[PDB]
């Protein structure tokens, strides 16, 4: 119930123990007026600071003037900050506006076509994106439906997804979470806790060349739709063989235990671990921060399943781009369709009361 | 932790709230009663299982390495987390296996009504499963393997995901909030209240069709709100739309949330006022009801809102007068039908031994 701390170096949401839940919008700008945008990016950041402290926005949900709406909705009224995070990016689309053409990151890569991509256009891409992430669905839908009222005529809702439930750990002295596979997810992540791994492989340095983005990130997102109908008519070893561990304890093969190392040689060379292991990635590493979606039937008589997976990473052409390269032999590709993409970079941190999401690229 | 499964009527409906849903209406596609009723068995031992938080079958891992596993492993490590599951018999059903005579009279088709936009993909359905539990994967769980343990016999029409409070952070006396931000389940039927129960929610033997006794019809309809369009509303108008105001949820000229409604204070069409049981002839509902955001549509307003779900004793006498009452609800404005289904729900599993739908199949 408790909340996290929003100021920082960086952003919270990356980092900070895994929520429950998360609702993930994308947005498109629909204003040409750099001032009215920072005015926005302002006004923005003085709601998030309210939301994530549990407080309503602006006057409050109620009290205020009968003939005017609201400045907040009301529906969170009551509740505990649950945790809620909100982590702003910017989509590669932004900066050909408002004259940010020359400040666009290098490390912020379009990616490239993957084997098997079916991706859709209108759920893929966004100049813009906040993840919101909360124990409370309820606290995260509130937090979007506020935003984007408060950015009425200046952005637009692009895409959105929900993810009901968390496939990923950044704290490893918790139970892993598992997937709609039926597998633990999230076993060999980065810890909140391992200060040098996050230094190494998920913040932006001011030697990496763009110095705006010091102390940021560079996000990922990929909608997958799972093939479930295939894999529950899938034996148990053939399961346990995409991935390289086994169902139950999610150990590696040959091992006892869920946190044994690895012995890659063991596994198929096809399975995923395998395959994504950073020793086979020539060290590549990523911090996931995904979450498994629903979105009802497909149709034909099933259940709709996927996982909205997120990547952190220091920079995109050196950490999800050689991963999946990677798995391009995948066995698991047999039962996963990626069919949205989009990418950001992930500012650094609000410092204090003063500052904006944004300011220093602004 | 858990809700006992057997009793002399169905868990779900009068036990405890629990914080998510997985809603699932189902087609059957088989024409053999033999099979069907091998089904309801099959289903019945699964949800046995289930909602006491084990595996279905042999497990979800440690069988036979050849064989898909029995249980598709997504609950593993998580608790019972109150799980309930409910099932219901629609209309349609009883066009199959010689049951046309045995068709409830109190499970009546419902009228059309005004502002009616009812997609026919997302209505209906011959089965539904209600999954209820504090831990929305536990409930997804129930609702994949139950279509699994079906394959063949029955496909997934439509689902439906939601939510209300969330326990851990919030207490369980608090009434929780509906996305317009309104104190939502104030006056409604509580689970304590036997003797009403007993009026307005259970079938009885002498009300005409004796496999019911015990059970309940219910009505479900997916209520779409038109968020973007509320939140431009004033908060006089918000609070009149309903009859309460908006911080306490008190009715008007009255200072607490459970001080008893004045309803000539209010509005003539304000909804607490039209919908009041002193409106419509007594006529009083058990809601059990949940939130859901699904995402957002193409235009890129949220497609949110209400899953409407009321438990009756008839659905003449329950759900058809009070919503012909609301015709002229200031509400209306706001909200659009778009999906409904109709149900009976038989009585419950007695022991053991006993079967989902065993009154009826004999
Ligand atoms: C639906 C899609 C996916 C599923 C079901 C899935 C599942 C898994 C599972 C079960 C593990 C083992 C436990 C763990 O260490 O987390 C794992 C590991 C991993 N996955 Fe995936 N994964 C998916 C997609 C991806 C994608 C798209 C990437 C990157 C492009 C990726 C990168 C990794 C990495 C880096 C590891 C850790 C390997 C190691 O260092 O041991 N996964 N995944
Ligand atoms: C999105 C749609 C709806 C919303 C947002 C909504 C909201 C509310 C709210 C805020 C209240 C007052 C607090 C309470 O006593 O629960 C209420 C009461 C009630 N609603 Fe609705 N409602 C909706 C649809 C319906 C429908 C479809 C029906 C029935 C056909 C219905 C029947 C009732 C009843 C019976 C009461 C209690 C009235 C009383 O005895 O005081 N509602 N609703």
């Given at each position: 119930g408790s909340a996290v701390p929003f100021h920082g170096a960086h952003q919270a949401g990356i980092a900070t123990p895994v929520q429950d839940r998360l609702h993930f919008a994308a947005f498109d700008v629909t204003t040409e007026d750099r001032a009215a945008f920072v005015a926005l990016l302002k006004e923005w950041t003085a709601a998030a600071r309210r939301l994530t402290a549990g407080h309503a926005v602006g006057?409050?949900?109620?009290?205020?003037?009968?003939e005017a709406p609201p400045d907040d909705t009301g529906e969170a009224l009551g509740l505990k900050p649950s945790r809620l995070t909100l982590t702003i990016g910017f989509g590669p689309?932004?900066?050909?506006?408002?004259?940010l053409a020359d400040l666009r990151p290098e490390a912020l890569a379009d990616l490239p076509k993957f084997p098997g991509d079916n991706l859709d256009r209108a759920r893929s891409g966004g100049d813009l994106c906040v993840q919101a992430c909360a124990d409370d669905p309820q606290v995260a839908v509130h937090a979007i439906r506020n935003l984007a009222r408060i950015g009425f005529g200046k952005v637009v809702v692009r895409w959105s997804q929900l993810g009901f439930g968390k496939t990923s750990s950044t704290t490893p002295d918790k139970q892993t979470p598992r997937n709609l596979l039926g597998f633990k997810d999230g076993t060999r992540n980065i810890a909140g806790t391992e200060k040098d791994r996050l230094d190494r492989f998920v913040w932006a340095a001011e030697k990496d060349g763009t110095p705006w983005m010091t102390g940021g990130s560079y996000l990922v997102a990929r909608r997958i739709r799972m093939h479930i109908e295939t894999w529950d008519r899938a034996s148990l070893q053939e399961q346990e063989d995409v991935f390289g561990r086994d169902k139950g304890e999610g150990a590696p093969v040959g091992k006892a235990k869920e946190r044994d190392e690895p012995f890659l040689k063991a596994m198929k060379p096809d399975a995923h671990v395998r395959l994504a292991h950073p020793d086979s990635n020539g060290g590549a590493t990523l911090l996931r921060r995904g979450y498994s979606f629903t979105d009802g039937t497909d149709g034909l008589g099933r259940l709709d399943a996927g996982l909205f997976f997120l990547a952190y990473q220091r920079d995109i052409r050196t950490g999800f781009v050689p991963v999946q390269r990677n798995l391009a032999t995948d066995a698991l590709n047999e039962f996963i369709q990626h069919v949205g993409s989009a990418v950001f970079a992930v500012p650094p941190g609000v410092r204090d009361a003063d500052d904006w999401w944004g300011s220093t690229l602004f």
């Open positions: 006057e409050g949900a109620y009290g205020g003037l009968p689309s932004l900066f050909t506006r408002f004259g």
